Amino acid sequence: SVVIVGKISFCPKDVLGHEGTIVYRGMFDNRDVAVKRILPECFSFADREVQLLRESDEHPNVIRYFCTEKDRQFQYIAIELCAATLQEYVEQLEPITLLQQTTSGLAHLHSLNIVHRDLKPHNILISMPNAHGKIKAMISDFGLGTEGWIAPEMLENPTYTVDIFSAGCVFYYVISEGSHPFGKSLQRQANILLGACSLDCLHPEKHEDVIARELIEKMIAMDPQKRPSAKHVLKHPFFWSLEKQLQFFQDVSDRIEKESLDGPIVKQLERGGRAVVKMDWRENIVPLQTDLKGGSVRDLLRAMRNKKHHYRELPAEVRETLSLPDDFVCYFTSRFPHLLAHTYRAMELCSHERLFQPYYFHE
Amino acid sequence: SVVIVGKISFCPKDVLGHGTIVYRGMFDNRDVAVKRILPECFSFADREVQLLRESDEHPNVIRYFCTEKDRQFQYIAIELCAATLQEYVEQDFAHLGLEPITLLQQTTSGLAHLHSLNIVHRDLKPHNILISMPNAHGKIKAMISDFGLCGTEGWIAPEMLSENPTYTVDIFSAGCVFYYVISEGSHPFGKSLQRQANILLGACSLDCLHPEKHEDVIARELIEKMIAMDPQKRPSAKHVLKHPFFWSLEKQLQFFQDVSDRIEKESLDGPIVKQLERGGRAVVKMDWRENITVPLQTDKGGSVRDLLRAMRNKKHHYRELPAEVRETLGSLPDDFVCYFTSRFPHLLAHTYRAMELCSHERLFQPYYFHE
Ligand SMILES: CC#CC(=O)Nc1cccc2c(Oc3ncccc3-c3ccnc(N[C@H]4CCCNC4)n3)c(C)ccc12
Ligand SMILES: CC#CC(=O)Nc1cccc2c(Oc3ncccc3-c3ccnc(N[C@H]4CCCNC4)n3)c(C)ccc12
């Protein structure tokens, strides 16, 4: 059989999940949709739920709301039918992109003065492929038995920094492919209050991890004033493409070319530089060894610029050990996993300069 | 007072446009526009809605909400917009700080989306292109509508009058819309009722685009291809999007550098400089060293290759330059690239089609359309 409450329709046989409510797979205007059926004891709550959807669903990374239908008994809410929740996606295509999409959607809600107050993999939906094979993450259940993803300040009028904490956990959740910064499921919320966090799955030698935890650690700070805004998060190197990373290493190598070692830039750039270059970055390269100091971070950055700018007019032997765009920068980041994370945090002195505005965040 | 048909509701007093009639209505407490199709067109409406559903997920394609049947007539509810592109160019609406290039960019993006779904618009014109209400951030956008269906013409490609069309049809229509937006009312093929007849003939004119303004040289280069009488010579939607017509001032500058760097180690007798110098004297205004302002003249004036290099090292070594010269060139990257394009309005157009040999090299693939 099939139930009908106006334009919405669904078969009670097909249930998708569940307060005292149920969610069915149904139809609306011959679209595939997920229909949430709710009891009369939540109509005052649903009208507020639908209100939020009508205002905020005009963004690709926010779940698309179609229609609601009141009946003699239960009320119904039609949402875009999705492939899976983020929880199912992990507990059963590209991770950085989902987090970028998720964070983008989150940044959107914050810009409309809307706090999610309960961001977690269950609320993050993964669309069906869109005739071009593209899947995307979409926020939902925003602005409204255990926990595990709640900020410690919420043990009401929360600020945006709350959702950031929740996202920071989600970030580690997708990269770790299941883990959580504050431990196993039932253990999380208690460890959150106690500030017991662990990023064990992120190794210190892996480049991608050094970048990630630099971001996440800030996102899951116990002091809300230290967490970055959603827009801030999006600009972090964690989301940069390999071309952008390499372009960041090139632009910085230009700014330093006219800078003296007595300047505050090289001072911060060489601060703890001995560890970034692995004592001597010359001992961690063979064909590329023929350069014609080895403890200076600056020189390493000067090296990659030159070999990139002259990559065309370079020996096939050198071009071999070094492709042009992605494999080139991977030569350095892989052999010097702290290079980008260090270069990025040191060059923040130029965060206001036009040349670095696309790399750093400030209104 | 208020006609309610299922979920859709509207006051018949508020007619938005005209045998279908379009009212300002409501659906699910959303502001919407309601098209009332008559019983003699229920077969066409079912096709119209079908397209709206499959082609809904794109920010530059009109958003479709719901449809409600009724014994009197069918109803179709879409997003309520501020105005059609026509209304904007005609009259009032000439404000809101609207960027013409951004509208054409948005329009073309929506079109590329329709094409990728194997849909031909068959009738793209300013009346169809709707201008959204400003969002919470005061941003508005263009959205395509009335696409894929089978009162005068003027925006129709010449092949469709002489059974189904190809993507290149919508390109001709777009090319005319480009001119219409830039010229703020004009049309390559003349006045309203004159257009379609001029289209069957070869009677087109872009005289609003002068060869002096650097923007107009770019606009002309693109549009002329888009409105070509021969369909096989028209760019695809995604091809149009790659054109310099849409490049930012930063990307225009970033282009001259990747070009200059590429020709740095190149011989002046090669096939890549001779192409760059092919008619180079006119690009540099006989001698570019004379067209330069008094200050910058201090730091081969008949070679485009040297001009790119001159702009390159001027940028690469900008941080270390005189304050007087820094005033002449201007602030990077916007005012700095406009310093040269203003005085050499054929440089960009020249350098672009010249460097099209490296359209498969990855350093230039972002600048050129390819399979
Ligand atoms: C303010 C505000 C708000 C808001 O958003 N209120 C919601 C309305 C309707 C459904 C919702 C919703 O929906 C589901 N709630 C529980 C379980 C499953 C689904 C759901 C939704 C869409 N699609 C799918 N697809 C299935 C296919 C089989 C594999 N699992 C995923 N499931 C979620 C989560 C969250 C919020 C929902
Ligand atoms: C396949 C397929 C398809 C498809 O899209 N089928 C359409 C359905 C409903 C309305 C449409 C439509 O709608 C209008 N048709 C005529 C006149 C006005 C409007 C209209 C629509 C939305 N908003 C506004 N706002 C007014 C506000 C006052 C200034 N003028 C614009 N007008 C247009 C054009 C074009 C197509 C429409």
Numbering used by the authors:
A (entry chain A): 562 to 579, 582 to 655, 663 to 714, 733 to 743, 749 to 878, 880 to 886, 893 to 922, 924 to 964
B (entry chain B): 562 to 579, 583 to 655, 657 to 715, 733 to 744, 749 to 885, 893 to 964
Q: What does the article say, verbatim?
A:
IRE1 integrates multiple functional domains into a single ER-membrane-spanning protein. The lumenal domain senses unfolded proteins in the ER through indirect and direct mechanisms: as a result, it undergoes dimerization and subsequent oligomerization. The association of the lumenal domain promotes dimerization and oligomerization of the cytoplasmic kinase-RNase tandem domain. The cytoplasmic domain has been shown to self-associate via different surface contacts, where a back-to-back (B2B) configuration is believed to fulfill the essential structural requirements for RNase activation.
In the biochemical RNase assay we found that less bulky substituents like buten- or butynamide (compound 1 and G-7658, respectively) led to higher RNase activation, while larger substituents such as branched and longer carbamates or amides (compounds 6-12) led to inhibition. We then co-crystallized a more potent allosteric RNase activator from our SAR effort, G-7658, with IRE1-0P and found that it superimposes perfectly with G-1749, except for an increase of approximately 0.5 Å in distance from E612. More potent allosteric RNase activators of IRE1-0P, such as G-7658, inhibited IRE1-3P only partially, suggesting that perhaps certain compounds experience mixed binding modes in the presence of phosphorylation, where their tail can be accommodated in either the front or back pocket. In an alternative scenario, an upward conformation of the loop in absence of phosphorylation in a B2B dimer can increase activity of the RNase domain. We show in our work that this kind of activation can be brought upon by small molecules such as G-1749 and G-7658, but whether this modulation is physiologically relevant remains to be seen.
